[PDB]
């Protein structure tokens, strides 16, 4: 079996938010529901990471490190994909029962949070990203940041990361494809990968603010609260190296 076919079979099942559409909407209600959904998506992301070939060979501390650094990148990218596949309209499809439409976008402070996530879906649409490219790109996002002083299994990590870069290359070549157009496409997809650091920076600013300001009464489930608590000191101590394809 090919490497991309193994990434495909471990794709998590779509989760429902359990959002009651008969009750009126509010920004607070949507944010709260999404944090609970995020916690369940993150538990499924751990099971997913464990089945990625090579991931389990890294030191356990590195496995934890990579999931903690990349969690928001993984969530926003998968959301970008679901939004891109559902429609060609400017919609965020968090779950099949929780889609942020134009009427929902008009709720106080909905748009300023949603614009960074809408950028991901609009880019996947503009670049006409394939399912195989997507699968390779999402695994690369798990491998997109490391500690300032590196991982315990740094050498093995670099080898695994290079393998998934070559795997993204193989997905691009399937369309079908011109040598010059291949390098152009590789450049474009890696540029989108790089821009995920900027999308995530913007999303974490809202995430960290709503987690820390207890007077906002915005709840996060245990899975997300634990990751956020771990990550906030790492950002304040500059303990992060954001890997880039383009300098």
């Amino acid at each position: 079996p090919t490497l991309v076919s193994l990434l495909e079979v471990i794709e998590p099942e779509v989760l429902y938010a359990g959002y009651d559409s008969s009750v009126p909407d509010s920004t607070w209600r949507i944010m709260t529901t999404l944090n609970m959904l995020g916690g369940r998506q993150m538990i499924a992301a751990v099971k997913w990471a464990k089945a990625i070939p090579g991931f389990r060979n890294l030191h356990l501390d590195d496995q934890m490190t990579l999931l903690q650094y990349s969690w928001m990148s993984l969530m926003a990218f998968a959301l970008g994909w679901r939004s891109y596949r559902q429609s060609s309209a400017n919609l965020l499809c968090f779950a099949p029962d929780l889609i942020i439409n134009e009427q929902r976008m008009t709720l106080p402070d909905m748009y300023d949070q949603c614009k960074h996530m809408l950028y991901v879906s609009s880019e996947l649409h503009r670049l006409q990203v394939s399912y195989e490219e997507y699968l390779c790109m999402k695994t690369l996002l798990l491998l997109s940041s490391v500690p300032k002083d590196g991982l315990k299994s740094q050498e093995l990590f670099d080898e695994i990361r290079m393998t998934y870069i070559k795997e993204l290359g193989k997905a691009i070549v399937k369309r079908e494809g011109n040598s010059s157009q291949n390098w152009q496409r590789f450049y474009q997809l890696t540029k989108l990968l790089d821009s995920m650091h900027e999308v995530v920076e913007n999303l974490l600013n809202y995430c960290f603010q709503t987690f820390l300001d207890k007077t906002m009464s915005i709840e996060f489930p245990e899975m997300l609260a634990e990751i956020i608590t771990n990550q906030i000191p790492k950002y304040s101590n500059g303990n992060i190296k954001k890997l880039l394809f383009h300098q």
């Binding site: 751990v46 464990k50 356990l60 245990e222 634990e226």
Partner: peptide, 13 residues
């Protein structure tokens, strides 16, 4: 401590 994450990584599945 990251109790939940370590548990999910160490448990079977």
């Amino acid at each position: 401590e990251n109790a939940l994450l370590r548990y999910l990584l160490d448990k079977d599945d």
